[PDB]
Amino acid sequence: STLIPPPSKKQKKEAQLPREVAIIPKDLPNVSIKFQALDTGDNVGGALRVPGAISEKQLEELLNQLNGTSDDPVPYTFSCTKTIDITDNLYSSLIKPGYNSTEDQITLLYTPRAVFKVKPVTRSSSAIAGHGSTILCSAFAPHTSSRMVTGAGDNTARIWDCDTQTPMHTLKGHYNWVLCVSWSPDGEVIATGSMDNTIRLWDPKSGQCLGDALRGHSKWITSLSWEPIHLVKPGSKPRLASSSKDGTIKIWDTVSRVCQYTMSGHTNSVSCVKWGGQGLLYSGSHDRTVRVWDINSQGRCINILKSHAHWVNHLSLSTDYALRIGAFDHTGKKPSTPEEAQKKALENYEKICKKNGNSEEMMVTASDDYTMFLWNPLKSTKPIARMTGHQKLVNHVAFSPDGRYIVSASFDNSIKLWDGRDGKFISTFRGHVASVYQVAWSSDCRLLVSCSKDTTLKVWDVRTRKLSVDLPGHKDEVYTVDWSVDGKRVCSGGKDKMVRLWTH
Amino acid sequence: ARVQPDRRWFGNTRVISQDALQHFRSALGETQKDTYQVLLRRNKLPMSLLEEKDADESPKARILDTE
Amino acid sequence: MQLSWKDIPTVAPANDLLDIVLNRTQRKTPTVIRPGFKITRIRAFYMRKVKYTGEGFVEKFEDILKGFPNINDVHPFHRDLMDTLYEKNHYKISLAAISRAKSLVEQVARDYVRLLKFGQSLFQCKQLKRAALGRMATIVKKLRDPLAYL
Amino acid sequence: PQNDYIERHIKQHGKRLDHEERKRKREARESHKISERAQKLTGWKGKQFAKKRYAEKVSMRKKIKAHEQSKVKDALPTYLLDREQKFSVPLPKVRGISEEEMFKVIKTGKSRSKSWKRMITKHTFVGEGFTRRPVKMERIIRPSALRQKKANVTHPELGVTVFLPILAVKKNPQSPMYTQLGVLTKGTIIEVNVSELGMVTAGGKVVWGKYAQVTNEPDRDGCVNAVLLV
RNA sequence: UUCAUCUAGACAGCCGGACGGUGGCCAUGGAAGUCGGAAUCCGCUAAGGAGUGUGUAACAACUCACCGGCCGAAUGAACUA
């Protein structure tokens, strides 16, 4: 094993020398600061003088008292413009490095954060067997973290109980490889789209198949999306959109188990379909185009976006986490009535959708031309930004659950972090020695997990922009990874025919 | 000329840890070269892993794949 | 301006170009060498084979490269017309493939002449010459589609 | 003339009056002409003609088989489909090479009376930081044109060949003297850099050095080919 | 040498038929079997490909895949020496 060079004799003498102590001064003068929001740029109080030894919690309470919301405070983070975040106190964060003097003002930008915290996963809970072939897709239940669905190449899916790390149900309806699995946003039905151009619906509690399979596609299913709960009328079940290799997006109403619309504008294989929160659908396909359809206009193609020089491999939405989670939260609370479920889903969607004046739903498309494009398809037809820097194709892309960051996993053994609003480049996550297949965020937007061809997972801290923990254990390539809604478990699977569950 | 069967031929000869990779990656870039220092011996390192530089632009897409 | 580009010599495909160059080497260079001759004579024989084949490939590639117009350097009207007719991207990519193949052939020729300087037997010199010609042939066979397009 | 002027001329004036009959008669004579060429062509042209005839017949039989087959009638993820690509060594015994073949006698002096210098005729690996010794003390000579730094290493799993740098010469089967001189012949065990292969151990360590065995004669073919020992 | 065809018709030749839904769907300035991409079905037949090639800007026209009429006795293919 190759080791870093040892310290020299002079360095050992310097180590044996006594150390300085970073203590807070007592005669520290008052500092003038100006509050400003990151999303809106609104100034609170103008220039206010605070003690130089102000702590982050006391500054948060001061901001809450300025806003008039001390009764129900919301935890925020602070940054200062080179932008430096506030770790412990103002003196150590800014004054101790000496970048800003006491006489000069300090412009503090505040950004809301999550009340809860997710601890990083540091070990494997279990390595569960059962599948006969390579594992292709995995997903967690939205309501609970104890249910995981995994579809593999042995023409089967499996429902695993995450509390005991044991298999619970086996789904054996399909005839060919189960390419994609998905859970309903209300947690009622699991949809499996397979290699044999079919889709099957399953009740997970009984582990049973609901009627016959959905048929009509001529080639294998590529992606599945569900209608958002906040758009579904109460008392109704969400519809299922499916993309496939044949170039068509089919919409299925599961109440009558029929097909309503068959969008057919693409001339090549549709890579992915996503059902947004404003009654629109976005499809990325191998004909270098992204098609924007309207569900309210008989499935007509509203727009065609053409800016890529190769296949668009993946797309993501700003509110994608909210659309996937539906009405549930990180605490696993279940609404009593469909009306309450619809209202809670609407609030969860709006908290990400409507901000900084007008409600916007940004989209990001990652393609085989080594690049990504950031769009705002509602207001404009041109792309808002172009993200470049990857030396190989960008296989996966994901918005943060708060919609403030974009993470792109490419085939050049790298991940890249970009701003979620204007698409400016932030940082590079390095450490994988093979191509990164896919990525996943944590619930509080502070941790990231990625699976790679080098048989390893990696957990990264977004704030410090560095690797947190490397997770080996898989015997071969890891194809699918997911993080639970409560941020307690991580599931992974690949060519070793084993489901790896990881916990803190 | 014969080679005897041995399990030493099939073992790993050189490995590097993630912490060592990060240390050398951060050190490569912070070096301040002195004109009066000469290179007496080069350290043996996986330079293909350690030499990763952020690039502002990506190369052009290969058009022969699609057309 | 040139205004006309008819005087471009015929571009043979990959297999036909290989036949032309290799059979030109076999015809125009001496073919009888004996194992009882001096090692210097044997080395010179096989060096001449490698160098002549490399020169033939290089001059064919140069005749291709000089003949075709420069799409960016012509008048913008002609540039737009040729872009509409022949897809300027494919045009430049094919010509760059020709240029890169020329460079690779030159490098193979130089390297194998240098290696043939240290041959110890007729068998070894023959193997080195066959290796040089086979690598040149692989380089040329990789140009099947750009040559037909051109 | 401009554009497709010959096709326009054929459209507006036709062809020669005996064109169709002459072409039909030539295509009818083609079988006799092929047989006469096969029986008359001599030497290299005859050999090439026979080779091309064999290739054409094989292609025709494959086409007929494909038509008849047509008339009779890895478990990859979504993002990877529609995309394409004992402890015994593979060469436990190789041909022995004597010192007479390995070394070449170099003579020095005006009358060439001294014969103590020896030149290595095979390809060598000299490592990093190599400086030639002074000529008065240089007995063993490794010429620069025969020095190698990289090799084409083939991985048995996944079936890929990569151009990898050479790290060390572990064992030359002929002699430990050749091992310490760095001679690269067939059957030699070398150490190669495998950083680009992305191998990770069970403990999370990145593998960047492994062993390979040379499978060819670089002095014969101008390059080093090796198989990775996995 | 082994498979096949054959006076309820052997190989060549000549003549006739070679249809209808239909200009099948998408695409194209135009594309009707014959620039392309995926289906490649049904009916009536003795038989007739959602077409083997020539040909048209597209059609048209010819052709052969196949069937029939005349002719009347052996013939074809693959291997071996």
Add this chain to the structure above:
RNA sequence: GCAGUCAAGCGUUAUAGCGACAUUGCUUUUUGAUUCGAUGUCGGCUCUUCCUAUCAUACCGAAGCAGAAUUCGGUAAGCGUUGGAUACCCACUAAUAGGGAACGGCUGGGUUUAGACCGUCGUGAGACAGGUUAGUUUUACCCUACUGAU
């Protein structure tokens, strides 16, 4: 070259093993950009003939071959294939093709012995990793062959 794939065959009643034609990966990536150790035999002058694996000249075939020009190919050795500068350039030219009878008479570099100097090594006599300069071998009237002559 190495490693692999397919299968017309070969082998067999144990879907073992050989295996033509094809094909992939490395060498080698995309916008026509921008000299690296020959350890021992080389070159001229004059002049003849031979090979064809044909550069030119003669006659043909094919090609988006309009004309002009050019490319590939066929028969073909009758006839030619240069002048210079220091292996590469310049020019003329129809063209400046390759090779054998040595490399299984004059003449320069080389086997150059005795003189001399510089460098490296050696305690030295001396040797060489080497570099420079100066340095006598002189038939024919014999037989045949060839050219002419009785």
